[PDB]
Structures are given as C-alpha cells and as structure tokens.
C-alpha cells in the first residue's frame, strides 16, 4: 500500500505549491503575500508521515476500475490527498498556538518562529483556504466536486467541535477530574480526531470513485470511527509506555491535564485513596509528581488492561469489516487496520 | 432601503441560532460544545450595524421579480445576509487577537474575556464553519448553492491574502515608511476590505436571483471594489479628523504604524525635513509625538486633499454606475453610494 505510493505523493507537493503560488503571478501586487503563503506551505505541510493523504491515494486505486485510472485521475487523487494534509496542517498550526506548544515533529512550531507569532492565525487560515483552491483548480468539472467540498467543510466543523469539547474538558491548568469520563473521552476522540483522520480520507476516495451513497458512507464511517477510537487510545497508551526511541516521542499527557484514555481508566479503577493521589498529582511540572501517576497506573495494571483492550478491539474491528465493508473491497479497510495494529 | 429591513434581519438571528444549536440536540454528547457555540455567536455576531448582511437582503429585493419573493425565498435572503455577518465576525475575532486589541464596538474583545484567551482561535473557526452549515440547511436544493459556497470561500481567501499583505506591510512595532506606497495601500484595501464588504453581498444576492454570468459579476465587481476603496479612504480620513461624538470612535491609526491613506498621501507630499519628522514621530505611544503628525498632515492640507478626492471619487463612481450597472437596476448600486457618501 504505503511504501510504493509515498514517493509519487511527496513529489506532487512541488506542483501543489506551484499552482497555488502562480494563479496570482498574473497579479503582481499580492506578490509578497504569495511568497509568505509559499513559506507557510513548505514549513507546515511537509515533515510528517503523510498517512492520511496517502490513504486517499491508496484507497482510490483500490476503488476505481483500473480502466479509469489515467494520468489526470491520479493527479486529482494526489491533489485531494494533499488537501487532507493541508487540512491537517491548518489544525496543527492553530492547535499549537492554542496549547502554547514549543515544537512539532521535533522542530520549532511555526508560531514560535521569530517574526511570526500570532500572525500564524492568518497563516493557518490560508492553509485551510488552499484546500478549496486545489479542489477548484483540479476538480471543478468532476461530478464529485460538490461532494468533496462538503466533506472537507464538514470534516473541519467536526474537528472544530471536537476541539471545543477538548478545550472545555481539559484546560491546561485546571484539574477537575470529574469531567474526565468515558462518554466524554470517546466524544472528543470521535469529533476531534477520528472523523478527519479516518473517515475523511477513505470517503474522499469513495466520492472520487462514484460511490456517493449515504448508506455506503454510513457503513464505511462506522468501521472508520471505530478504528480512529483505537488509534487514539493506542496513542494515549504509548504516550506513557511506548519506547521513546520507538515512537520518536516522549509523552507529556499527564503534565498537561489531558483527558487521556489512561486517566479515564484510572478513574474507573480507583478507590478514594487513589483518586486523591490522582487529584493531588495529575498534571504538574514536578517529575516525581508525574512518577506517582505512572506508578499508580502500573499498580492498576493499565498496561495489561490496554493489552486486553487491544485484542478485543482488533476482533471487534475485524467483525465490523466482515459486516460493513461490502461492497467495498475489505482491503481498503484491512490496509489501515494493518497500519494501526 | 436599510431602516425598513433591519427589524426583520436582526429578528431572524434568533432562528439562525436555533438552527445551529439544535441540528445536534439529537447528539447529546456534544451539548457543551454547542452551548459554547451559542455563546460565541451571540457575543460576536451581534452589536454591529449589519450593513453588509442587510445589503444582501436589500439587493435581493431589488433584483428578484417580486413574483418569486415568497416566505421561503426571503428567509434564505436573511440567512445569507447572516452568513456575510458571520464571515465578518470570524475575521474580527481573529484580527482582534492578531492586533492585541482590547475592545471592539466599544466592548471587550472576545479573546480578552476571562476564560477565553487563545481558545478564541477555535471560536473564530467555528463562526466560519457556521456559514457553510447555514448554506447547507437553507440553500442546498437551490440552483445557486455551489455558486454561493464558492463565493464565500473565495471571499475568505481574498480577505486572508489581504490580511497577510497588511501584516507584512504594517507590523505593529516596525516603522519602515518605505513600504507605505499607494499601489500597496490600494492592494491591501481591495483584498482585505472591499471584496467581502462590497462585492460579496451584492454578488450573493445576484446569484440568489439567477444572475450568475461572469460578465455581470465582473461589471458589478468593478463598481463595488471602487466603492470599497473610497469607503476605506474615508475611514482613514475620519479616524483622525472625524468628530469623535459623530463616529462613536476615536482613531489610533498613527500610533499603530497603520498604512493609512493619510500617511501614503503625506509621503507623496513631503520634503525630506517632513519625512524625518514623520520617520521620528509615526507610531509612538506619546500623544505629542502623534500631535506632531496630525499637525503635519494639517500643514499639508490633507483635509482639503481628501475633500477634493471625495468629490472626484463620487463623480467617478457615478460614471461607473452609468457605464456598468446595466442590466442591473442602478438603484442596487446607488443605495450603497448614498450610504457611504
């Protein structure tokens, strides 16, 4: 799936940048704004793994009768993959400002760069706008055009709703473990992460392939949101117990008063002595006050609970594919399941 | 035009809020996010003059054979007027954060409210998203639907480009009067202000009326961007010389190193002794260092130059209406000209 197509996907980026910075090279006056847009694109859409954009391309190839896969159709697939990556970039540039993060993908967040600061708010908005310029440039005469506009807009709105929910639930600075519930956790994950990361890219490829039916989309969505829930739970687990030289990351969830899967589980599993030890330790600078939490999680066998959850979640996802994939090829879904499990 | 329709326009807001906060009252889990959205709407879309949203409604009535003006068509007109107002609210909430403003419409900027801060970035994004939820809810089955989606997206992109240009030109903190040129001034005004404030609302009403032709839109646009340039120049003039009890405002353009029409004119009109006095005084806290600028503007008869510019600009706009209005009724344009002149 992914290895093969990546090459061609990253290489199409240069052309994405050309087209977005040259439709107004017949408008001299905005030159300097266009140069800034170029810099925003290059700094922020490049450097991740591209899993979500690639999924568009892979899914497209599995879905479209190979007969209808000319140079032009593939180019639209790469472009729409890149749109998912721009949606992503928009969210991250903006979330980094909202969180006051320092780095992203191990480099300095865009807004932290000397001379950028809160101007990054407009930069993020430009990234979002670039999605719709690409659709128009590449897809306006296709019959799925309006379907794709609506899917991207809807994906943005769900992501934003999810973000609002996260922000209400989990202010960086206010412990109130009372709001860290399971129903709320699943909610945040579904809106903030699973819709754009898992439904968006397959749905887009579905539409490019003519599969516009509400039912098919409802069916695919059911499988994909469930995958997205697992992916994020695995992210929360690995934030703390992952090997840091394996993730390339080192987690700060507990420091940041995150509504992690772990703390939800913890709060289901605690006697009151534990809750206090959690109330008094969740989310401080102090390393040893974080130690007390990682230790308490271990004392409640959350690694084992996770291991059990992952086995169950994998059988459950497989039954969902059995049940809801048709008439799409199960491979569209199984390729993603292999990637995350 | 405006007096009559305002009543019904402001009153439709309640229903706009209902619809946007009730499509997910069948989704309990996001309840708290929806309540926050309600608060964001009420605080930020209400309290201005509504001139741009109203223009949609007025233009619509002048453009549509009265025969096709049923309850449902008018309701769509009010809704699309409200969309222009949401686009506006989105821009202002975000610009206020980028500028570090304190107040807006004489009340505390949204991001300055205790508990909001940089979460306002997501709030602004929700306001933007609300535009497309309204179009979908109210207009998805109309034949102009995709035309309106594209117009709002394009209006956002132009506004953002304009903002970027402004931000590059005029950093709050770096005097470099070398970048304050006429061509650059007109550019910022056109992209950042005139397109969404003047072309957007009439264009939208044009599409709702079936007038989708590129030529008609090109013609209308030519008149409306020229009006937008005057409106902003008049804004820059009045920022400094307006009667404050008449504007309800009191201008800080010079303090903020703005690329005002005034400083552009000034720089065309200065001997070097003056440029230095401008280089050394443009854009400080100090009241007396601002006094020296308002005084220097008066010493170059910029009030008279403005008065001349406004006479010329009014003849020029009238000739544009003569030439480019048809086959739209000149009144669509003349009502706006009466409002701004």
Swiss-Prot record, chains A, B:
The keyword Cytoplasm applies. Pathway: Isoprenoid biosynthesis; farnesyl diphosphate biosynthesis; farnesyl diphosphate from geranyl diphosphate and isopentenyl diphosphate: step 1/1; Isoprenoid biosynthesis; geranyl diphosphate biosynthesis; geranyl diphosphate from dimethylallyl diphosphate and isopentenyl diphosphate: step 1/1. Binds 2 Mg(2+) ions per subunit. It comes from the Eukaryota. Key enzyme in isoprenoid biosynthesis which catalyzes the formation of farnesyl diphosphate (FPP), a precursor for several classes of essential metabolites including sterols, dolichols, carotenoids, and ubiquinones. FPP also serves as substrate for protein farnesylation and geranylgeranylation. Catalyzes the sequential condensation of isopentenyl pyrophosphate with the allylic pyrophosphates, dimethylallyl pyrophosphate, and then with the resultant geranylpyrophosphate to the ultimate product farnesyl pyrophosphate. It is linked to Porokeratosis 9, multiple types: A form of porokeratosis, a disorder of faulty keratinization characterized by one or more atrophic patches surrounded by a distinctive hyperkeratotic ridgelike border called the cornoid lamella. The keratotic lesions can progress to overt cutaneous neoplasms, typically squamous cell carcinomas. Multiple clinical variants of porokeratosis are recognized, including porokeratosis of Mibelli, linear porokeratosis, disseminated superficial actinic porokeratosis, palmoplantar porokeratosis, and punctate porokeratosis. This is Farnesyl pyrophosphate synthase.
């Amino acid at each position: 799936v992914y290895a093969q197509e990546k090459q061609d996907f990253v290489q199409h980026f240069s052309q994405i940048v050309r087209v977005l910075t040259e439709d107004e090279m017949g408008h001299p006056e905005i030159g300097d704004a266009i140069a800034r847009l170029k810099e925003v694109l290059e700094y922020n859409a490049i450097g991740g793994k591209y899993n979500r954009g690639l999924t568009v391309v892979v899914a497209f190839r599995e879905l479209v009768e190979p007969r209808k896969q000319d140079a032009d159709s593939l180019q639209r697939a790469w472009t729409v993959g890149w749109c998912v990556e721009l949606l992503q970039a928009f969210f991250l540039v903006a979330d980094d400002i909202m969180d006051s993060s320092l780095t992203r993908r191990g480099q300095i967040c865009w807004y932290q760069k000397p001379g950028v600061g809160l101007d990054a708010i407009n930069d993020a908005n430009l990234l979002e706008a670039c999605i719709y310029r690409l659709l128009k440039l590449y897809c306006r005469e296709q019959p799925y055009y309006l379907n794709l506009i609506e899917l991207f807009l809807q994906s943005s709105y769900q992501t934003e709703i999810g973000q609002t929910l996260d922000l209400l639930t989990a202010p960086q600075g206010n412990v109130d473990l009372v709001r860290f519930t399971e129903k709320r956790y699943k909610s945040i994950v579904k809106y903030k992460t699973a819709f754009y990361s898992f439904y968006l890219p397959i749905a887009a490829a579905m539409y490019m392939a003519g599969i516009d039916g509400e039912k098919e989309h409802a069916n695919a969505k059911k499988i994909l949101l469930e995958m997205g829930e697992f992916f994020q739970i695995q992210d929360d687990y690995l934030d703390l117990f992952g090997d840091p030289s394996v993730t390339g990351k080192i987690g700060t969830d507990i420091q940041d008063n995150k509504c992690s899967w772990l703390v939800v589980q913890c709060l289901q599993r605690a006697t009151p002595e534990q809750y206090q030890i959690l109330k008094e330790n969740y989310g401080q600078k102090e390393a040893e006050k974080v130690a007390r939490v990682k230790a308490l999680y271990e004392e409640l066998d959350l690694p084992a609970v996770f291991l059990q959850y992952e086995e169950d979640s994998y059988s459950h996802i497989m039954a969902l594919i059995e049940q809801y994939a048709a008439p799409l090829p199960p491979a569209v879904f199984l390729g993603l399941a292999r990637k995350i499990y």
